[PDB]
Paper text:
PepI first catalyzes the formation of the central statine, then produces the C-terminal statine moiety. Among these, the homolog kvPepI from Kitasatospora viridis DSM44826, with 53.3% sequence identity to PepI, was more amenable to study.
To rule out the possibility of H62A mutation causing a loss of activity due to allosteric effects, we also solved the structures of [name] and [name] in complex with [name], which are virtually identical to kvPepI apo and kvPepI-[name] complex structures, respectively. Taken together, these findings strongly support the role of His62 as the proton-donating residue. Site-directed mutagenesis and kvPepI-9 modeling studies support the role of His62 as a potential catalytic residue, as corroborated by the abolishment of enzymatic activity regardless of whether 9 or 13 were used as the substrate.
Residue numbers in the entry:
A (entry chain B): 25 to 185, 197 to 304
B (entry chain A): 25 to 189, 195 to 304
The structure:
């Protein structure tokens, strides 16, 4: 699948630069602006509408909704509206929600880990039953969640982080592919790269980073799917290898790396 | 011909930086500011006047006008006005138009490729008959369009990409044929017509070979060697890029080179070296 690149922007209360930041993302060549779903951050669909007003090309996605925060029928109302009123530019990433303090603050039942996955499952089933027009992404590495992505999702998002080894990712991607079966080729695979480390000596940088990861070898650090290290050409070759190995074609980076990663889009976008 | 360097800027509604952007282009050493003709973009001659008020040296050009948008007599009025009220600093690039939704939004007939090219031909003939004082550029790679450039234009702009009326980059070998086609049509007038091309990407790198290899992902129909010869791409250090542009002026005759707004700063070092 052809590469698509996203940047995870955080619309922050009291910060007045939202429109400018979204323009910079589009002008820098990103294909997708992604926003989170958290307390203390701007509301995601409202922020996406403000982004749509100052951009023309990028897709706009949640990355990812906390299923505990949304009533499925009312979420389907939101998604239909966001689709129609942006001209079809909205996608919806969903996940389980993992911060207990946010449930407590909002007066929601934390339940059990399995109850929180069932909330995601029930939401996915309802959104498909209501035929929402927005493409759906499912994120999370748990067995059941990956099964739900295999069943319902247009895009599956794998977490790379406690950074996951390339060998551990092999096992999660293989587990997903077994669940997806004959659907496998119809599901785009996403991951979020947590750090983009520009360096003219990736070998020395990796060896030095054993300071913060003494439990990994330098080769293991250079193979961590959530880290990209080196020059733009090296980073592009790393992403090409990771698309072959893991199937990852939809790659997101964090806001602080927007400019650091942009040269890679010039080679692969 | 001596090199001339342009940057294609997009004057955008709701973005208050137009004057600042135009001054940066001139201060960075560009010879030309180019603006498009599209719905949703600021109106081209009005944006050009705003640019002329804050710059002193650069030429200002359309790059390129959608011929379906303009009545030839009224366009001649605009061109004479722009010429006199800027002191001779305006040039007009013209093309056929190619985005069907813009025709439809403006209530214009998309028609056929034939009718869109005939509209360009009719407009060029009328502008020459009205003796407009602005230099005229004609852009596009179709046989009829390059024939019109050979007949009428002061500058011919060779497109480095095709797209069903997204972009597919054309090889250096195909560009060789397009330049030779134009030259044959131009005949004795060939040497009086400046040749332009737009570079789509300016990629600063210390490993041009590794860069080109990776870029095959975006252009699977090309080899790395072909990527390094694409006229729409500049790859390497500023010195390597300057040497490439010298080689491409000898191979293709390209002396008027434009880059896209995103690469304004990336390309400016090359201007330093070629001057
Ligand atoms: C559409 C284009 O024809 P062209 O003569 O090369 O260019 C015509 C116009 O697009 C051109 O004159 C300009 O108006 C376009 N143009 C702009 N046009 C505008 O209207 N506004 C602009 O601001 C503008 C800017 C601009 C900047 C640079 C540039 O190079 C062109 C620009 C083209 O891609 N032609 C292909 C043919 C494409 C086609 O018809 N079919 C496809 C599919 C084949 C099939 O399925 O049948 C193909 O042959 O590959 C070709 O010659 O090979």
């Amino acid at each position: 699948r052809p590469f698509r690149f996203g940047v995870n922007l955080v619309p922050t209360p009291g910060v007045s630069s939202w429109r400018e930041t979204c323009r910079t993302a589009e002008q820098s060549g990103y294909d997708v602006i992604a926003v989170p779903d958290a307390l203390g951050v701007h509301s995601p669909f409202i922020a996406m509408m403000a982004a749509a007003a100052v951009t023309e090309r990028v897709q706009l996605t949640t990355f990812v909704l906390n299923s505990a925060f949304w009533n499925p029928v009312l979420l389907a109302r939101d998604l239909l509206t966001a689709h129609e009123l942006t001209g079809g530019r909205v996608e919806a990433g969903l996940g389980t929600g993992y911060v207990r303090a946010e449930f407590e603050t909002a007066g929601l039942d934390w339940g059990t880990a399995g109850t929180r996955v069932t909330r995601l499952a029930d939401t996915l089933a309802a959104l498909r039953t209501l035929a929402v027009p927005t493409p759906l992404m499912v994120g999370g590495n748990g067995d059941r969640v990956l099964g739900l992505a295999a069943e319902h999702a247009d895009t599956v998002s794998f977490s790379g982080a406690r950074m996951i080894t390339a060998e551990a990712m092999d096992e999660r991607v293989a587990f997903f592919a077994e669940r997806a079966g004959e659907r496998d080729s119809q599901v785009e695979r996403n991951t979020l790269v947590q750090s983009v480390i520009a360096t003219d000596d990736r070998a020395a940088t990796a060896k030095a980073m054993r300071s913060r990861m003494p439990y990994l070898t330098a080769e293991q650090i250079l193979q961590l799917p959530t880290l990209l290290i080196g020059t733009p050409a090296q980073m592009a070759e790393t992403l090409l290898e990771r698309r072959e190995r893991f199937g990852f074609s939809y790659v997101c980076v964090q806001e602080r790396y927007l400019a650091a990663f942009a040269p890679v889009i010039g080679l692969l976008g």
